[PDB]
Structures are given as structure tokens and as C-alpha cells.
Amino acid sequence: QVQLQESGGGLVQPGGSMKLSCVASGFTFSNYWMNWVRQSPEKGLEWVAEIRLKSNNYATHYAESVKGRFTISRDDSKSSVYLQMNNLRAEDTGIYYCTGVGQFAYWGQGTTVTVSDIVVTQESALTTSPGETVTLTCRSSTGAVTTSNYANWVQEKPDHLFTGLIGGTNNRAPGVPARFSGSLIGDKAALTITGAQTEDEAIYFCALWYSNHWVFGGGTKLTVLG
């Protein structure tokens, strides 16, 4: 039971600043790249920044929506990652998560921040029943999804509890039940639940990698009925 614990959010004015923190345990923090991802009701799940390793001179990349404003840093001696957020705008409101590892196995519980061009497409909703086989899909506006997109799948359960299921197209994250698998089918990434269970009712997001950034899909609401 790996842990990522965020802190720092709050209720803030437009034009202001704040710094989020995140403290990791249970895995060799310093071997993995780390990311900040945020969720808002409008705009869904959105990758914000990544930081790589000491051996990469801690190189960073940012979403274009925050470049110039946000800075990601890490402190390997404290197994922590940080996000300094300057010049905040209403559109920055959301729940902020630090996440990483193969590539988005581990998520923090999230910290709320209230301030007051590739599209990745997923089915809005699918309905299944216990014991059925259900496949979710993830299409890119650029064209076919390939293994060079390192498709990830992540599950959101109540209350904003994220856990990574699949990385690198078809690698199950550690401890993920065997009923989940990843594939590429008809030039889309796909997640299959072979024998759906009632507890799999949840929201599922895919993430695809384009050279130096992640784009999340809008998520699929999976209902498990009966």
C-alpha cells in the first residue's frame, strides 16, 4: 500500500499564488517521473506537468494551459513533488493529484483548489452486468493509436479516488485484478473487463502520450447492473 499524499489547496483569489506538495512512500520515488493532473467538472481530467529524474537534470514539461505560470519540482531526499502555481485564474479551479509510475499506477487523494490540440475520445457511458465481458475504447483525433502512445487506463471511484489499471498499452499495474486487460483494437486503445464485478462500476479514463505530453480522454461511465 504505496501512498501519495497531497497538501496545500484552498480557496484563493484570481491573480494569486499557491504551492501544492505531495509526499510519496512505498516505492523508490527517485526512479520515477512524477506528474500533476487536475480534475474539474467542466474540462474533465487534464494533465498539467511532469518532472523526470536527477539523471535527466530534472527536466520538465507543461501543458500549454499553464506554461509560464506553474512550476513542478521534486525533492528526492524528502520523496516529494511540488507544484508552484502563479497568477491563478478561474479555469485553474479543480482537484489536483500527483501521480506517476508505469505511467499513472499511483494517485494521491487530491487537494482542492478553488479560484474565485489533440482530442482523445471515449464512450460517454456503457452498461454491463456482473459476469459479462465489456470493452472500453480510446480514440485519438490525430489518427491511429499505436504502442508509441503508451496508452494508460485509470479508474475513478467515489469520492475522486483514482487508481491506475494499465500502462504501456497492456501492462497491468501492480496489484490490479486479472480481469482487467489492455489492448489495441481497430486503431484504438481498449480496456477489457473479462467478467465485470459490481464494484467495477466507476469512471474510466485513458491517457495517450504524444512525444512529451499526455492527453486524457473524457472518461467512460461504466454501470454494472444486476
Binding site: 517521473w33 509510475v101 508505469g102 501492462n171 499495474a173
Partner: peptide
Amino acid sequence: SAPDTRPA
């Protein structure tokens, strides 16, 4: 140019 492809 790949992402963090290191095993979990």
C-alpha cells in the same frame, strides 16, 4: 521519445 517506461 517515450514516457516513463520504467516497470512499476
